[PDB]
């Protein structure tokens, strides 16, 4: 509902450190690994399994065990500069192609 941040500056610099992000989860009952989420730039909002990226501000919920933090970050927030720094455009391309071909079948 807010536009995604596509600049090279994080929207939430307080959540720029891995450990700051990790503290937001507390006891975490959900399908997806909190360290894997924090590594993908996500921090917990404290409302179910709602997460936001510190950089793009992008929000995600309802984590299925088959859903990967980085893959989901690329699917929904392809313009995130943090995603690009960490993963590269080659990875990001694969993910898009895979998702866009998942639809076909």
Ligand X SMILES: COC[C@H]1C[NH2+][C@H](C)CN1CC(=O)N1CC(C)(C)c2ncc(Cc3ccccc3)cc21
Q: Which residues bind Zn ion (CB under 5 A)?
A: 53, 55-56, 58, 77, 80, 82
Q: What is the spatial distance between Cα 56 and Cα 92, in angstroms, rounded to a whole number?
A: 15
Of positions 12, 30, 59, 79, contacts ligand X by CB under 6 A: 59
Residue nearest to ligand X (CB): 59
**Span from 6-14, 20-28, 55-63, 80-88 in contact with ligand X (CB under 6 A):** 55-63
**Span from 13-21, 58-66, 78-86, 90-98 in contact with ligand X (CB under 6 A):** 58-66
Question: Residue 52, SS3?
Answer: strand
Residues binding ligand X: number (CB under 6 A): 10
In the complex with Zn ion, which residue's Cβ is closer, 58 or 69?
58
- In the list ligand X, Zn ion, Na ion, none, the entry touching 26 (Cβ below 5 to 8 angstroms by class) is Na ion
Angle between the N-to-C axes of helices 81-104 and 69-76, in degrees from 0 to 180, rounded to the nearest 10: 90
In sequence order, which residues have a C-beta less than 8 Å from that of residue 69 and are 6 or more positions away? 32, 36, 37, 39, 40, 42
Q: What is the spatial distance between Cα 78 and Cα 70, in angstroms, rounded to a whole number?
A: 10
């Amino acid at each position: 509902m807010n536009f995604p941040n596509s600049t090279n500056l994080p929207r939430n610099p307080s959540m720029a450190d891995y450990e700051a992000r990790i503290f937001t989860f507390g006891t975490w009952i959900y399908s997806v690994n909190k360290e894997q989420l924090a590594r993908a730039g996500f921090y917990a909002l404290g409302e179910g399994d709602k997460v936001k990226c510190f950089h793009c501000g992008g929000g995600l919920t309802d984590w299925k065990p088959s859903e990967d933090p980085w893959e989901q970050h690329a699917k929904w927030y392809p313009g995130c500069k943090y995603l690009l720094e960490q993963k590269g455009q080659e990875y990001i391309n694969n993910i898009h192609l895979t998702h866009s071909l998942e639809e076909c079948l």
